[PDB]
Amino acid sequence: MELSFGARAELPRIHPVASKLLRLMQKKETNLCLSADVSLARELLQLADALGPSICMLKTHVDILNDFTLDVMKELITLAKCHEFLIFEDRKFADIGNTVKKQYEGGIFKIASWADLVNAHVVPGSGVVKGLQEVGLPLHRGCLLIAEMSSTGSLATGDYTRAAVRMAEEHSEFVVGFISGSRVSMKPEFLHLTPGVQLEAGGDNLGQQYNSPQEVIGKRGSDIIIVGRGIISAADRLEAAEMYRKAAWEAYLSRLG
Amino acid sequence: MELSFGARAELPRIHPVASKLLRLMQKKETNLCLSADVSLARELLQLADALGPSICMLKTHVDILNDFTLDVMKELITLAKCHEFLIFEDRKFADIGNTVKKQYEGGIFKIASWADLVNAHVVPGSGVVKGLQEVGLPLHRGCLLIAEMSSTGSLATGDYTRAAVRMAEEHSEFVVGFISGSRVSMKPEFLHLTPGVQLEAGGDNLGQQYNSPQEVIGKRGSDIIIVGRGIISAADRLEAAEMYRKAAWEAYLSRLG
Ligand SMILES: Cc1cn([C@H]2C[C@H](O)[C@@H](COP(=O)(O)O)O2)c(=O)[nH]c1=O
Ligand SMILES: Cc1cn([C@H]2C[C@H](O)[C@@H](COP(=O)(O)O)O2)c(=O)[nH]c1=O
């Protein structure tokens, strides 16, 4: 018996960040996360403003933002609050717990001070989560664990995926879901976000592999599609975002029955 | 048949950045990499200058450097040239090929412009290496693949480690070695760098596990020790670096018989 996003937002064990996300997904009829893989602050803010109404989440990539400052982040947060979407930073936390804590809080980027969500690879073992949560829990943040990857030759399969699920379900005070290609947890409190999404079949020239919104949401049971080039390379980015939103949303409704 | 670092520098298939490293290791009698996990440029540069003569490599951590600028990295290059050590940036590239390319070249940090070596996780598949290579190849950079991890619960074991070795073998134009706990390749062109090293037994409270220089160089067959807190937390970091250098160097000499 599958629950709607709005009902999942109310589950007793839901994490506050997941609840906030699920409520705005339901309100706005969007389960699309825009991957904003851009080099300029002006492009990031322009896309966030123009596409904000169509998205539940914006995945930032601050490591490639040539003119990052914390003032840009302040402005991005203003747009996120106005249009109602969460900010998910791309950075791949993937080190021992002692140093990921410093990477999350510190440096020039101060990721924990503006990202609602971050993601981590599980390869270090659960210390990666324990280190992140020492920063994320005081800042009321959530984390996604990379349980599967979309690229050719991915090693995030089999027992590796199972380890990611166990690590999430044992750190539910901080971990709110997964980056995955499919549903991997049977617990409805966890979110599933799927990159490697385009309307048409294909890939890229460096190992990316694409599946459609209907396949990943409808057949594979994921919750949210993450789309970069399928939107940003389109002539009309607003229309492209709307096409992806409508595709992902219908696929969700049809699985819901 | 074990070869000295100086002889390995002359191997037919050696990459130019590995040859440079192996030659300075032999010249200076050091197989120590300092893990400069500090948040201030002045401390980084003071450590690089004082410990430069004792190290073959300095592992930077720019994501935690609160006052990073490219001018700081210019001064680090000057010290690296003066004292003869390589610069290895910590950032754990762990994305699809198309995005890691941009992360390596771009943003504020412009890692490829100053780092001799970078490291990647192999979980995405070989596209991670191909994307980095598209930037680093003409710059005579090299990459290290994370084949094993030192932390409790590491998933970099078994077939995962074997996949890392195969990926390195198959990309030897750019991959010059491993982050590992032991020798994982039989090919002497490859470097093995081992973190999780301290003179004393123990660990940390976030899953780090330590082994001694004698164990990891002498018994486990690795080439270089990566040492952070064992040096950084000492009152006199120069004396500590010298203790680690002598331990790792004499363990290496023991192998040669
Ligand atoms: C963990 C993970 C991230 N991503 C990231 C890389 C890009 O920032 C984004 C996909 O962008 P794209 O839609 O332009 O291919 O998602 C994957 O594509 N696959 C994965 O498995
Ligand atoms: C890939 C990898 C990196 N590292 C990094 C994290 C730190 O920057 C450094 C170890 O620092 P430490 O000597 O203070 O524990 O090396 C590991 O400790 N283990 C690993 O397996």
Author numbering:
A (entry chain A), B (entry chain B): 223 to 479
Quote the study on this structure.
Orotidine 5′-monophosphate decarboxylase (OMPDC) converts orotidine 5′-monophosphate (OMP) into uridine 5′-monophosphate (UMP) and CO2 during the final step of de novo pyrimidine synthesis, which is essential for producing DNA and RNA nucleotides. Recognized as one of the most efficient enzymes, OMPDC accelerates the decarboxylation rate by a factor of 1017, and exhibits a net transition-state stabilization (ΔG #) of 31 kcal/mol. Its unique ability lies in achieving this substantial enhancement without the aid of bioorganic cofactors or metal ions, relying solely on interactions between the substrate OMP and residues at the active site. However, the key catalytic amino acids at the active site are highly conserved, including two lysines (K281, K314) and two aspartic acids (D312, D317), which form the so-called catalytic tetrad in the sequence Asp317-Lys314-Asp312-Lys281 (numbering from the human enzyme).
Interestingly, the wild-type enzyme can also bind TMP, but with much lower affinity (K D = 119 ± 9 μM), which is 16 times weaker than its affinity for UMP. The phosphate gripper and pyrimidine loop surround dTMP, forming the same hydrogen bonds observed with the product UMP. The main differences are observed in the catalytic tetrad, which adopts multiple conformations, indicating high flexibility that may explain the lower binding affinity and possibly results from the absence of the 2′–OH group. Therefore, dTMP generally is not a suitable inhibitor for OMPDC, although the 5-methyl group is well stabilized by van der Waals interactions, as it points directly into the hydrophobic pocket formed by residues Met371, Ile368, and Ile401. Ligand binding stabilizes the enzyme’s closed conformation, while two major alternate conformations of the catalytic tetrad are visible, highlighting high flexibility. Interestingly, human OMPDC can bind dTMP. This suggests that the methyl group at C5 may compensate for the loss of binding energy provided by the 2′–OH group.
